[PDB]
């Protein structure tokens, strides 16, 4: 049925895949985006620019502790499925096998 077997002769993983890089409970790159957004708010107003940071940051931390590095998935979606055009025309995202007809 399966070559798998219940044996203690194991190579432990140590579960270091949960302790992926983080600084204050969040990966730095999404937190870099949070800082960029806080600066964007600071362009509009300084009173609540720093104030908006703890809410978003806490949301990031609590999401990451649930399912780590989901932000990479979010970025991949935004980059690939979102940016594609003519999604409605084909009924789904499509990529022409052939190159640009003009290409000039």
């Amino acid at each position: 049925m399966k070559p798998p077997q219940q044996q203690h002769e194991a190579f432990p993983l140590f579960k270091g895949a949960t302790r992926l890089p983080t600084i204050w409970g969040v990966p730095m790159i999404p937190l870099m985006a949070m800082v960029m957004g806080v600066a964007v708010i600071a362009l509009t107003v300084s009173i609540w620019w720093w104030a908006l940071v703890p809410p978003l940051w806490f949301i990031m931390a609590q999401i990451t502790k649930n399912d780590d590095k989901a932000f990479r998935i979010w970025w991949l979606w935004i980059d690939t499925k979102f940016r594609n055009r003519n999604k409605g025309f084909w009924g789904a995202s499509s990529y022409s096998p052939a190159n640009y007809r003009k290409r000039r």
Binding site: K2, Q7, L13, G16, L20, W77, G91
Partner: protein
């Protein structure tokens, strides 16, 4: 509209962005848009069903040890267990009635059995530098075209060294390196076909032209769903719906074969493992993060501390390196519901072992482009794992399945069912024991299944129209030989056969006939018989007490059961018969077939001729098929050493009186293999096939499956049945081999 179509296609994004490949820089190595040179290894995996538990762990340890030297941060591995439906094996074409009907029945016998076979491909890339940050800074600078050539040369040398080391490490495995193959006055790329199969979903041969590989690689339009977990490929052959899956949680144990459950299954899929090795600095940093977060224990667990403490010592001084791993499984199906239920089955199978998967959503195209070996950036969920754990996830275990098509002499001779469930494409030619060796030795213990199996193989191998010469025992295959076009030539006592001892160069041949004729000697008759041969008191006695036409038929036999007492009959009989058939060896395909080794032992010079002549015929369409009803006493023969050494395909039939000693020293097979073999009780049909180093407990069956009614009696061998059928053949007297119906009436008494 015509202008509307133009403005739409101008908006459309080509697929060439996601396919980072370019010219073959070397015959075995592919380039990349980012100079990440690639090479694909086609591996014939090791057989795991032998179920030698400790040996699996030993194999994993050895793979890790051999990989250690290659393990360096500039490396990666992508493993793809592609499991496919097979169409390459063609339906056979037949002339004789009996063999054609047997083929028809056997083909009908596989309605409802899965014909999918899984083959394993390992792709190894060599990124020049794996800097976390410095790579980005270096990427945006121009370089000297001669120094780019320097990078080319150094990378090619390193990758060639890697391939050589891996090939030396994978001796027990298939270890075949895909390279350029030319066909029709124009070059082709075998590795390109694999990458196309990954990206196109179908095997499309890829000619190599002056343009870059990426632009013309894709011939099928992919349509990834929006807000969906499956995608659709639009192709001329058909529309293929593929669904993806991802692993999100791991366990510590990593007992090897945790993913083997997926191999034997009913859904066609592609399984991906990428192991982007990680440098020891970052490795110990990652380890230290978990170490620290454990030290923040608050009495979380006492054991885990001494479970992790050994990690530092093993990482510094062991032969393993950390890595980045993601697993993605792509099920191909023809309808949306079918692929979804396949995904449910696969998730159930993964949840069976301690891993917990989760379907990939919002990253379908990312996971799909991650399948390509060179796509670093599209990794959906990279995780840090131990190298031992990586080999545990991908231990190159595979149910043995011979090549269906492309084998020497063409397609696989037969398709045999397997106990595990993966169909086995039987074929005589095996990789290791240049032109492939076709030797076979059908050892067994007093089981008529030997005769039935041999007759079935002959009837099915009739597809190649090959010349076959048989030396049967106990009238076993007289009916089988007569069934196809052939002459039995029974050597019954009291009537010398059609040939007389004389023959019609020729004097050189009959020289040894004189020498073997010398019995009850041998010095004065060295040439005194030779001169009379130019043109012995007991010699004329044998001549008076002796108590042919070839090439008009394709199959031959010889009722040689009589000469089990006096070799001076048997030895000249084999000498004359072998010399006779020697002419037809070079004419076309040949398969000698035997049933004993002690009569061949009676020759005492058949070894002397065979030691070179087996190579000579083997070069030109020569095949031996050996059999033994007493394997225990077989290896005792002086010639038996050469018999065991030369054998290519080893087939064992259930022997209750099995020997550990013989089957270990000769008939080389593992201890677990021997336990499995002896586990076969007497009269069990299943028979182990050690075709090559890999082995599988294939079985053959003939029972009603919702047939074989006439062939069940014909394949077997019975003295009563054979003599009675000889009575019918005497009555009918018809060279029209289709004569079978007349005998079918006399089946009334036996089949009453």
């Amino acid at each position: 509209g015509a202008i509307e179509s133009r403005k739409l296609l101008a908006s459309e994004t080509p697929v060439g962005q996601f396919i980072p490949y370019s010219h073959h820089v070397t015959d075995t190595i592919i380039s990349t848009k980012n100079a990440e040179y690639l090479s694909v290894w086609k591996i014939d995996g090791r057989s795991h069903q032998s179920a030698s538990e400790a040996d699996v762990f030993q194999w994993i340890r050895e793979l890790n040890n051999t990989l250690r030297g290659i393990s360096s941060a500039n490396l990666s591995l992508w493993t793809h267990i592609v499991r496919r439906r097979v169409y390459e094996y063609p339906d056979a074409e037949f002339d004789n009635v009996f063999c054609r009907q047997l083929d028809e029945k056997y083909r009908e016998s596989f309605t409802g059995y899965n014909l999918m076979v899984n083959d394993l491909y390992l792709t190894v890339v060599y990124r020049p530098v794996s800097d976390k940050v410095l790579s980005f800074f270096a990427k945006r600078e121009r370089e000297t075209p001669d120094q780019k050539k320097h990078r080319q040369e150094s990378c090619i040398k390193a990758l060639e060294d890697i391939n050589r080391t891996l090939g030396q490490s994978f001796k027990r495995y298939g270890a075949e390196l895909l390279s350029v193959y030319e066909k029709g006055g124009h070059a082709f790329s075998a590795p390109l076909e694999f990458l196309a199969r990954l990206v196109n979903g179908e095997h499309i041969p890829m000619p190599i032209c002056r343009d870059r590989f990426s632009d013309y690689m894709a011939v099928n339009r992919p349509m990834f769903s929006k807000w969906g977990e499956v995608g659709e490929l639009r192709s001329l052959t058909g529309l293929r719906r593929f669904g993806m899956l991802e692993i999100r949680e791991y366990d510590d144990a990593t007992e090897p074969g945790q993913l083997n459950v997926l191999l034997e299954s009913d859904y066609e899929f592609v399984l991906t493992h990428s192991f982007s090795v990680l440098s020891r600095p970052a490795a110990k940093e990652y380890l230290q993060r978990h170490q620290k977060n454990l030290i923040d224990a608050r009495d979380v667990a006492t054991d885990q501390i001494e479970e992790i403490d050994e990690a530092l010592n093993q990482l510094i001084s062991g032969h393993f390196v950390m890595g980045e791993h993601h697993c993605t499984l792509t099920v191909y199906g023809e309808t949306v519901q079918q692929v979804r239920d396949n995904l449910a089955h696969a998730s159930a199978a993964m949840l069976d072992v301690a891993v917990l998967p989760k379907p990939v959503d919002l990253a379908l195209e990312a996971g799909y482009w991650a399948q390509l070996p060179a796509n670093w950036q599209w990794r959906p969920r990279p995780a840090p794992i131990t190298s031992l754990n990586f080999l545990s996830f991908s231990p190159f275990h595979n149910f043995m399945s011979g090549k269906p098509t492309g084998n020497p002499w063409g397609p696989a001779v037969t398709i045999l069912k397997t106990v595990s469930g993966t169909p086995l494409y039987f074929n005589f030619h095996a990789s290791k024991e240049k032109r492939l060796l076709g030797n076979t030795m059908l050892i067994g213990q007093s089981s008529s299944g030997k005769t039935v199996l041999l007759g079935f193989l002959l009837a099915q191998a009739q597809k190649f129209k090959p010349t076959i010469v048989a030396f049967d025992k106990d009238r076993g295959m007289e009916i089988s030989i007569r069934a196809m076009g052939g002459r039995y030539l029974p050597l019954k006592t009291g009537e010398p056969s059609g040939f007389n001892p004389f023959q019609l160069h020729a004097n050189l041949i009959f020289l040894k006939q004189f020498v073997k004729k010398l019995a009850a000697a041998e010095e004065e008759i060295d040439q005194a018989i030779t001169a009379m041969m130019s043109d012995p008191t007991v010699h004329a006695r044998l001549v008076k007490w002796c108590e042919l036409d070839l090439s008009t038929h394709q199959i031959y036999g010889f009722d040689i059961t009589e000469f089990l007492d006096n070799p001076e009959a048997r030895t000249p009989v084999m000498m004359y018969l072998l010399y006779r058939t020697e002419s037809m060896i070079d004419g076309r395909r040949f398969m000698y077939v035997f049933d004993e080794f002690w009569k061949p032992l009676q020759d005492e010079y058949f070894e002397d001729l065979a030691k070179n002549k087996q190579k000579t015929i083997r070069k030109q369409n020569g095949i031996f098929v050996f059999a033994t009803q007493e394997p225990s006493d077989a290896l005792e023969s002086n010639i038996a050493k050469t018999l065991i050494q030369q054998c290519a395909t080893y087939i064992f039939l259930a022997n209750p009186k099995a020997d550990y000693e013989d089957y270990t020293q000769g008939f080389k097979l593992t201890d677990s293999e021997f336990e499995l073999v002896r586990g076969l009780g007497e009269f069990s049909r299943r028979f182990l096939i050690k075709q090559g180093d890999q082995s599988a407990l294939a079985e053959m069956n003939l029972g009603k499956f919702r047939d074989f009614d006439d062939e069940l009696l014909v394949l077997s061998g019975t003295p009563d049945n054979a003599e009675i059928a000889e009575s019918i053949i005497a009555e009918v007297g018809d060279d029209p081999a289709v004569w079978l119906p007349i005998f079918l009436d006399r089946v009334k008494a036996e089949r009453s």
